[PDB]
Design a protein around this ligand. Sequence first.
Ligand code: PLX
Ligand code: PEE
Ligand code: NDP
Ligand code: DCQ
Ligand code: SF4
Ligand code: SF4
Ligand code: SF4
Ligand code: ZN
Lengths: 342, 96, 176, 156, 115, 144, 63, 208
Amino acid sequence: LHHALIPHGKGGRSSVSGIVATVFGATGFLGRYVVNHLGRMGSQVIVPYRCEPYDTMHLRPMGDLGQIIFMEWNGKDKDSIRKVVEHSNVVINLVGREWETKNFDFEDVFVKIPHAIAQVSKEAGVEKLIHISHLNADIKSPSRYLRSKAVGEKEVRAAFPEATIIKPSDIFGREDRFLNYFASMRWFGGVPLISLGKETVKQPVYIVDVSKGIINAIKDPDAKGKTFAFVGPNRYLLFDLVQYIFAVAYRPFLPYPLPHFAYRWVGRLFEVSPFEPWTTRDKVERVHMSDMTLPHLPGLEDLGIQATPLELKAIEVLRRHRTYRWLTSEMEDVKPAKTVNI
Amino acid sequence: GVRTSPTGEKVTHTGQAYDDGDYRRVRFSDRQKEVNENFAIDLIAEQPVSEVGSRVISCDGGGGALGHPRVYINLDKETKTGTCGYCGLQFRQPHH
Amino acid sequence: TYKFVNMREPSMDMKSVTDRAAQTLLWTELVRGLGMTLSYLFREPATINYPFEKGPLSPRFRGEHALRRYPSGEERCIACKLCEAVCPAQAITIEAEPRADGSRRTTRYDIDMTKCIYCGFCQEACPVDAIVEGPNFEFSTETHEELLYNKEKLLNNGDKWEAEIAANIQADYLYR
Amino acid sequence: SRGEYVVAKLDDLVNWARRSSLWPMTFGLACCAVEMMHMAAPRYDMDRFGVVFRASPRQSDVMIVAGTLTNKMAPALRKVYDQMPEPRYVVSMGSCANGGGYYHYSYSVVRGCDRIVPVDIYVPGCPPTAEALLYGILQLQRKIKREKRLRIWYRR
Amino acid sequence: GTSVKPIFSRDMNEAKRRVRELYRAWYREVPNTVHLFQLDISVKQGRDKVREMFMKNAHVTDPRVVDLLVIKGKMELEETINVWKQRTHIMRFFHETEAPRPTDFLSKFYVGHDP
Amino acid sequence: ELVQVLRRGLQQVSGHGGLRGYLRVLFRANDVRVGTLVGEDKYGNKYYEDNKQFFGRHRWVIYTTEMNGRDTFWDVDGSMVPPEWHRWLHCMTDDPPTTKPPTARKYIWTNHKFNVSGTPQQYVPYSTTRKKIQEWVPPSTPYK
Amino acid sequence: QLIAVDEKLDITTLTGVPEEHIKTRKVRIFVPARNNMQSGVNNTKKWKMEFDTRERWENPLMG
Amino acid sequence: TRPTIRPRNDVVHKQLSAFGQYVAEILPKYVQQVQVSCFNELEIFIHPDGVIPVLTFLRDHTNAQFKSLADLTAVDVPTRQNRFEIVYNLLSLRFNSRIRVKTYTDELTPIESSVTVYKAANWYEREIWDMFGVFFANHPDLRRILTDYGFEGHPFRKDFPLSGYVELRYDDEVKRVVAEPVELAQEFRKFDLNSPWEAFPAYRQPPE
Ligand SMILES: CCCCCCCCCCCCCCCCC[C@@H](O)O[C@H](CO[C@H](O)CCCCCCCCCCCCCCC)COP(=O)(O)OCC[N+](C)(C)C
Ligand SMILES: CCCCCCCC/C=C\CCCCCCCC(=O)O[C@H](COC(=O)CCCCCCC/C=C/CCCCCCCC)COP(=O)(O)OCCN
Ligand SMILES: NC(=O)C1=CN([C@@H]2O[C@H](COP(=O)(O)OP(=O)(O)OC[C@H]3O[C@@H](n4cnc5c(N)ncnc54)[C@H](OP(=O)(O)O)[C@@H]3O)[C@@H](O)[C@H]2O)C=CC1
Ligand SMILES: CCCCCCCCCCC1=C(C)C(=O)C(OC)=C(OC)C1=O
Ligand code: SF4
Ligand code: SF4
Ligand code: SF4
Ligand SMILES: [Zn+2]
């Protein structure tokens, strides 16, 4: 087990966990939580970054001296990948956009890059590979996002047969694009919902739950070549979920029905932003797609994790979206939403 | 007297080089490994043995008070030279 | 012996009262303060043109640590561990063993520069003038790890600064 | 390309503006703050470089952690760091702020301010001289000169 | 006789009465602490934590130790009411960033050498 | 005495090698004074002296435009000064390294390097000692 | 006037010590043995209390 | 003797011994011992019940006039049945003299507050409580002065670890500063410095 990679200590900041993890996409939403959970217990974390180094400062205090290393990398360059995965025994892939840029489409970020990472990790001798997919990934999906996700997981399994594939469903957290996205809709006055959100079921999952599931999957020997689905404990109709979101933020809820073609046109209109789009046609599709039910897959409870209900962690995200007059309202004030549990 | 390991890592004067399978090598990627090139053992090995005509010699490292504490070295054995325990200089009595 | 600071009485003659009234109505001490500031305005400033000009220092100045050599190139350090014992911040970590030629030398000599207080106790305790505080003070870094010096870093510092260090010691060794 | 040249020149302009106007928060903790004052003194005159102290964190660009950070003080330092609008920079000055220094093994001392906030420049010394702090500030300026935010955005 | 000077209470009954008064004060304060500090926990969680902290020292039978514990509890309550504590201090009672350490023999044997 | 200061300014302009040199020293150092040259580095730094200035301005260095690997036309720092001129410049001695050269040693660096933090040449700390505990190597052959 | 308590002294709840470092620790009470390298006996006069030795490991940085 | 040895002052020694005898005679109910050190410092040992009467007498008596409380602190000696030694340092401006009053207490026995005698005693008693856990009865506002909010234990006790039990760091998941059990990358290195040979025969103890 390579004595230098033998666990030591109490399990804290100055301890040794025996994990040397290269975390692709560590500068995003899930990446910071994953790096934080790796660094709490004394793991060596390699952070490949393409952005400006100023955008990686928040990751520095997450590890002891020498336990977090930053190197530049290029998604379209295999030498960068091999350079950042030579000395690792765990490789985690969290790379992904929610929109298509002029340099990287969905096939570039969900198919080509994951496949290259998996192939390089396999030829480099990496023992464990964690690949993130979507619960709604489907080759026959109306979303290019999910089709690319399905093709990407097929090719990752082809290139790294012992990889672990995780399929979370609409992760919510402080820096998410799920609760914040719905909360952001108040500016346009009314909330446009296709079919008033009455024909969509969502099963959102907590960010800490997903990060702890990834951490436990690294440490679990049976989770080597399995496929997991990370979902929350409750299923909600989209209308009720958005109504609860607006109720927690104490904002007036004015839902109106909008036709699919018109709201797709709105998404296309928003897609022309050279910066981060406020919404896209792909987001239009994914918001109004019901979350699949996959009872044949192991879940968070198979990794020792009890799923955190949204009603316990919604306030820490939506209190920022309140006005001054409702900032101090307590968590148990907002009458949790009705749940369609089978 | 620097020397490289079969991996390409420079071996320091203390002889420590990471094993090819050691993950701690990653700290030198995109960076360098600090190694001092003036190996003191080779440098002191180049100094000639001083010939002196007494059984006991004194060494303070040169420079008076800028050297080391002054010690006295016995030179009775012709089999080996008298080495200073502080500086490493060598002394011997005339033979041959 | 002592003196009083606020035990003077103003004279009540018409001359003094009129002078005080003129001071009150015409703001004479405020004009005096303005005059002092105006006087300072036309003086030459005390600013130096750093980094082209530098503040004066002394041979006794304590800067970055360095490890020195004998004129033959042999290390002066003999692993006596006096500096480690005396170090008030426990910033020095030393390990030693007999060398391949039987010499008493270190295998580890680390100075945690973020633990160090730059007191110079270590260079006082050294009996062979092996560890010194150099004249350099411009060695700021971008990461914490770069301030954890090992034996190679200190030996390189000595090799790089010996020309100045020997001259500084030559000027002060008769005070020590 | 034309766009590459345009974004490079825009980066140059923004970086010059940001490094030529660096306003540190009026914030000090211990012995080091005295050397900070002396670096503000007429001999060195940081104001001639464009460096002006401002009390409000909302109006400050840099935080200089000059002194020991204790456990009781860490939440306040984190609070005032957070309230700083971006871009913001942190300079760690002195052994106490760098790694705990001479109170490293104390029960009430944080072993380095990098456990609380990200650090851009570490200034060694106990205390660092005012000239050493000026060198650290100029190094921070040189680091700001190397930022390529708009190039990275364009290449996305 | 053991000749010991008291602090506040002559015996365990007055100590119990002081404990009950301190518990009442903390129970009243908890909702105000939840509102003022903008805590993400509920009032039930805070009151359960107060009960847990009180029951932590249930085995004490010395009235002087009980009096000192009540004094410390009143100091903590005075810190909390005056907002001398911050949110970090209040949340330190919950240990939300520490991993759950197992208690069984086999897990301790696997992880390390601590008994 | 106004014409005197104007003529001294004109002399400063003419003493820097012309108008282009005047603007070069104005934009490279924010200082246009003319002093007596003391010496020059092997790296290109020029050292001047003017004893009529007060303590602190009587010695200064004009930095080179190209040290070991980088362009230093604008990016200069105090770590570019070699140790001997470092000793002279900080007034630790009254003697320049020209009249009083340092002592030559075979182990002294022949090429001075500046602060290399933030560069691929930066110092990376590592343990310098050997592995302490040796593990038992199992035999490579079957046992039955 | 005094209260006459009748229970053995216990101050564990007032020392602020974590539960792990009260019930799992073993302290040794002894007079230290003379360092055999020397003949002085001035270090063998008093009684000492020390705790049981716990795990020490190498730091990945600096060893 | 002469150049390197500290000179003596017999006049101050006799004056302090006489005043110690005076104070012991005036307050036999509380005074247990009076000592004069060889560098001319007067120490008076009292019973804990006499904290208020003795300090009041030393402050208000015409021949004492110790109107200034220089310092008040505690010393922890775990080997004693009464753990904590309470030290009062007083200064007389009328007579240009200093005096030290010492008493004792354990972890559970309160000591009377001296704020009625000296207003300076407020923060000193607060610091003694914070650092040693000695409770002062009738203190107008007794609470921690030096330690962090919610800090457990009394650091200045000899059995408190030097680095404590908890350390602080910022945690990004909870977006706040958290407290966790201490782990040190480098452990503080304990040094055994005491020589096995006796240094001062004048302080040798009986071999029991
Ligand atoms: C018109 C209203 C709208 C626009 C608002 C902005 C107004 C125009 C901006 C003014 C530009 C002036 C900045 C140029 C100053 C640079 C000075 C020089 O020193 O820079 C050097 C090199 O220059 C920089 O690399 C780049 C500066 C120029 C940037 C490119 C020009 C872009 C102009 C585009 C205009 C468009 C404005 C927006 C329109 C909507 C780097 O040297 P430096 O390290 O500092 O100094 C070392 C310190 N020493 C000397 C003491 C040792
Ligand atoms: C023959 C018939 C003539 C008719 C009558 C004409 C004669 C008038 C003679 C008296 C005129 C006096 C005018 C002054 C008015 C105010 C003076 C005054 O007393 O104010 C001061 C306070 O005023 C100040 O001190 C000013 C404070 C702010 C200072 C700011 C800078 C100072 C000004 C710099 C220079 C001023 C230049 C002004 C003109 C600029 C050009 C437009 C009083 O304050 P105290 O001393 O505290 O006494 C109060 C209790 N007895
Ligand atoms: N968020 C959710 O609700 C769900 C997320 N997932 C998956 O989880 C993963 C990450 O989640 P999240 O963290 O929210 O996504 P983020 O966008 O928040 O993080 C994206 C990361 O991917 C990197 N990245 C994206 N495109 C590229 C590229 N072309 N080249 C290099 N690096 C790139 C980004 O680097 P930079 O910062 O430089 O862009 C960033 O570090 C994604 O794969 C996503 O599909 C799965 C199910 C639901
Ligand atoms: C305008 C003059 C320059 C002021 C520079 C800002 C000083 C910031 C440090 C804060 C501080 C101040 C103000 C201060 O006055 C002081 O002495 C009591 C300190 O102790 C070291 C300080 O830390
Ligand atoms: S200068 Fe002082 S603190 Fe620094 S290493 Fe030497 S003895 Fe230790
Ligand atoms: S540097 Fe000097 S004092 Fe320290 S171990 Fe070496 S010889 Fe001894
Ligand atoms: S580093 Fe030194 S000078 Fe600075 S605050 Fe700490 S002890 Fe004081
Ligand atoms: Zn010698």
